[PDB]
Design a protein around this ligand. Sequence first.
Ligand code: HEM
Ligand code: HEM
Ligand code: HEM
Ligand code: HEM
Lengths: 141, 141, 146, 146
Amino acid sequence: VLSPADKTNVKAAWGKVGAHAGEYGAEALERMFLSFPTTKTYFPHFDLSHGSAQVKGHGKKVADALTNAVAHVDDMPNALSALSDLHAHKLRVDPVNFKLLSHCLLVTLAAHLPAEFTPAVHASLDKFLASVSTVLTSKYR
Amino acid sequence: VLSPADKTNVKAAWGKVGAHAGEYGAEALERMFLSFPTTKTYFPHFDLSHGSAQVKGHGKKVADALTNAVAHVDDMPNALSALSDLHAHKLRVDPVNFKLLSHCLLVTLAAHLPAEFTPAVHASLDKFLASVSTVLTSKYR
Amino acid sequence: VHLTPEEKSAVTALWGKVNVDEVGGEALGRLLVVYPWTQRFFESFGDLSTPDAVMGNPKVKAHGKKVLGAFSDGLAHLDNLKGTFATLSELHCDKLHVDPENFRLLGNVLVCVLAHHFGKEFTPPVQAAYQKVVAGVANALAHKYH
Amino acid sequence: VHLTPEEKSAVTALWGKVNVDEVGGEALGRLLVVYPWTQRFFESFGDLSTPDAVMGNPKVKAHGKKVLGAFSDGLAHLDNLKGTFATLSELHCDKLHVDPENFRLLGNVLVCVLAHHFGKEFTPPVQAAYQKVVAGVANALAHKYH
Ligand code: HEM
Ligand code: HEM
Ligand code: HEM
Ligand code: HEM
């Protein structure tokens, strides 16, 4: 569970990222499709090319769901119910993939915010993303 | 999340196991320490030998926590709070280990109840154990 | 992979009694049922939405037979896993992009299938022996991948 | 592992600019901090209960230096990973019994460390190249284990 310090760190990271959220989400998605080709099979009719407008657009949706999770740390499953049914009971997204995206999301932050991505922040962000992943694959357990 | 059929299957398995619960838990623990030596390091002062009375005893504690989870499918984290703090924030049990024990628990059931351990039951039990594992490593996320 | 004489011997013994035409389809089907995301890899197989539709699917059975075949060939060359499996590794890694965690998963489903078929004969020591052979196969399958 | 000419070249280029005395202790420490169960493997190191106590621990730094050393030797023999790593695999698999998932973990922490140090220069394509080299090392480290 996210401690009080973890919430502070997570929200501080969110505030610093600010308006860049959608873009960082699109960058994470691009890192995932490129580093881990298996994930591409989940978006067949998507234009997955570098400047894809559709990846840009999907990045923003992901960032916004993350913002929503950030706002409901203790109410996450209710908060992302639909989203969980979508990935778990419909697309049947491999749980591993969530760890892979979580990782690309951290790589993206570390590339943009080196000074602020300290070990302690890195640990808080990882806990946070694992909580989100737990929920999104929730319908499996 | 456990569907209505999953709860039925899980409780049906629990009822059939009956009085054998502690013993199957001890057998699962023995399968885990033997198949995956890394887990042994978590019980340094334990007599980990075959007929160990201490492993027999630990098996019963595990089975009882599982019975408790079975009784609180929708209230699991409250139900296993202490237990979660114990494994997650104190012993720092590697999450992988939970998957390894879950597996030995299923292997134990399949060895004793072949006729009843059908694919559908196997899937329901696995969901159940993954829900328990989610909680026990909970304090991490 | 290094097996003691009694492990090496227990593996061979049990394996000699395995129904090669059944056990593989059972491990595959169970995998598809227990970890439903793996069905994505076999859309060509058809409707896999109920366990029965999965367990009895001709293609699942036929293909599981080929998998079991691959394990047997591993049990015969336990000293050269990266060998017989150099081919299957490229198909699974370079072409299919299957995460290794999924090989682990299928190897453990196989172990549950063996436990299912042998009952109390699938003792903790015997399981221990098969877990070693299974992890080897998985790791060999995950070489020349990434 | 098979890298395209531009991947193979991007890896070498970035690596030439890596501070070998720092980056390894940073990946190790971050691992110990982010996945606290891994601290069990280094009790001899002392109190690892705060991130600062971890990041600055002399032993963490010294040992991370040896790890980074091992990766470099992998980047020089990308064609023979199972080679230079035959030794470290026995120490990590047969003696330490470290689950492979943990190798994956450390390989990805290294990638975050590189991203941290290189900023926008650690482009998605460059990350993609390092993810291949990292998965190779992990798989090579997990051979002759189980
Ligand atoms: C941090 C975890 C993730 C979050 C926050 C997230 C969020 C979202 C959101 C907000 C949507 C749109 C929902 C809708 O319109 O109904 C979506 C859809 C989708 N996501 Fe995720 N997702 C995550 C991870 C994953 C992963 C790991 C994969 C696959 C490798 C995945 C596969 C998809 C697919 C296939 C869609 C549907 C795309 C389409 O056809 O429109 N998601 N995701
Ligand atoms: C199905 C998952 C598990 C359940 C239901 C479970 C349940 C329990 C219970 C009921 C106790 C005693 C609690 C107490 O007396 O306060 C316990 C303690 C313990 N368990 Fe678990 N456990 C599980 C998995 C694990 C795993 C995977 C490991 C390690 C490989 C682990 C390591 C331990 C340790 C080291 C103790 C303390 C033993 C001692 O020194 O007394 N547990 N567990
Ligand atoms: C324990 C490890 C495994 C073994 C021993 C194994 C073995 C095999 C064999 C022998 C074939 C046919 C190969 C050929 O004809 O050249 C095959 C094909 C294939 N395997 Fe596996 N496999 C394993 C794990 C997996 C898993 C985990 C998945 C993914 C969930 C997977 C997906 C496939 C696919 C899609 C094919 C081709 C299907 C087709 O023939 O239409 N395999 N495998
Ligand atoms: C990316 C994979 C990894 C690499 C490249 C690596 C490399 C190394 C090297 C080069 C040494 C010294 C070996 C020797 O002196 O013969 C070492 C020792 C060791 N490693 Fe790793 N390692 C990896 C992952 C891990 C992880 C994931 C853990 C567990 C959480 C671990 C635990 C240890 C331990 C306990 C030692 C000995 C510690 C000591 O010297 O007191 N290693 N490793």
